[model samples]
Target: LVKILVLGPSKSGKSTVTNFLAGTRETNPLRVLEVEIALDAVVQLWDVGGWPAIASNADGIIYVFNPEVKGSEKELLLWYKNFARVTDGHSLIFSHHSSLPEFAVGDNAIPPMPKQLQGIRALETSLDYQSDNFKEAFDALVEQIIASRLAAE
Candidate 1:
């Protein structure tokens, strides 16, 4: 019922990001991963579409990042803040061991958030791939998407 985009620069490991989200790291990483097109009483399935397909209209954004891709963190707004929804947790950042892995943010500690994305949630993957942890995070992302509607594009 919601269109979610998987976004990131080409080098940030997009395939792995998409797969883990849908319980698919061991499955398809092309043309999206899993589709749950539901119309009232019926929920249909189809091939997926993933990539930096971060354009056009959508609800939530799942951004994959290279942990150490220089100052890309500072460039998050440049990527989506302008067009994304204002939902508190609509956008998420997925960081794995990208040769620049530094995924640690205190939940109860002071905020380590960048000035740009006050609403973007951080996800530290690069752990157990087959783990349901991945789907848990994805479910959260979808839940965020399922709860909003306000955009021109």
Candidate 2:
């Protein structure tokens, strides 16, 4: 099973992403959802707070953020820095609530992220499950997991 940590600021859709990945509508500050994929592989989604106590134990990290909210970018960088302090594992950035292009986009395009976050993969997503955004994002995450596993082998 692949263990992934879902970390972000409060109300940043961390729980929402967890529920979506778990195929449920439940909400919790800290919850574990085990999802089964092809090849009998399981993904353990750990939706937890900003405490980096378990950073070393995770195989990958998913950092969610809402650019529409003020100071979110700053807080996200802080979280990224904290995570970087502990591990150099695979990481992905989720730009949540991206439906509002104006709020998140600039000059008809998404604003550039900092140099520290440039190399990591990022995806724009919304809270709505009906949308394909999260699906694509989750698939990307699964792909990352697969790559990590293969690298270890």
Candidate 3:
């Protein structure tokens, strides 16, 4: 099974995005624990708490953001830095709040983060909490996951 980890500060839509990808109903309504997607392939999705330990084994991570949250930019950047240290060059994606300023293409990974990164891509929409544009953004996000996972395999 390919292991994937979805991480972000609380209320950043990490649960929403993981549910969308796993094609599973979200439990807890507000928090996610872990999810698994299996059919043609096995993808284990872990909803990492905003804690340090879980970040260590993350091979692939998705960073979620909420623009409405205070200091979200700095927090997101900090999360990226921490996650990168653990993944050590793993693949990562960013899901930004719709209202957040956009990063230039390919600037998805924070410069200060250390990792043997494959690369980073951005999905410029917040999940569930915003407008209905998440589907499109999510499709792009999934495509990136598929391509990256396959290449890694």
The estimated TM-scores of all candidates read 0.61, 0.77, 0.55
What stretches of model 2 exceed 4 Å from their correct place?
Answer: 26-29, 39-41, 85-89, 98-102, 105-110, 129-132, 147-153
Instruction: Find the 10 residues in a row with the least total lDDT in model 2.
Output: 128-137
Give the per-residue lDDT digits (tens) of candidate 3, residues 1-153: 445667677766677667666677633422334434322234566776544565655556667656445565566556666766555434444544534444422444222222322245444454432333544544444344556655966
- Give one digit per residue, the lDDT tens place, for model 1 in 4-51: 666565566656655444455432443455544222211111222322
lDDT of each: 0.50, 0.68, 0.52
Off by over 4 Å in 3: 26-41, 51-53, 85-119, 127-153
Measured by lDDT, the strongest candidate is 2
lDDT, candidate 2, 83-123, per-residue tens? 66554646777777734555775441234567777677666
- Sorting all predicted structures by TM-score, with the top scorer first, yields 2, 1, 3
- CA lDDT for candidate 2: 0.68
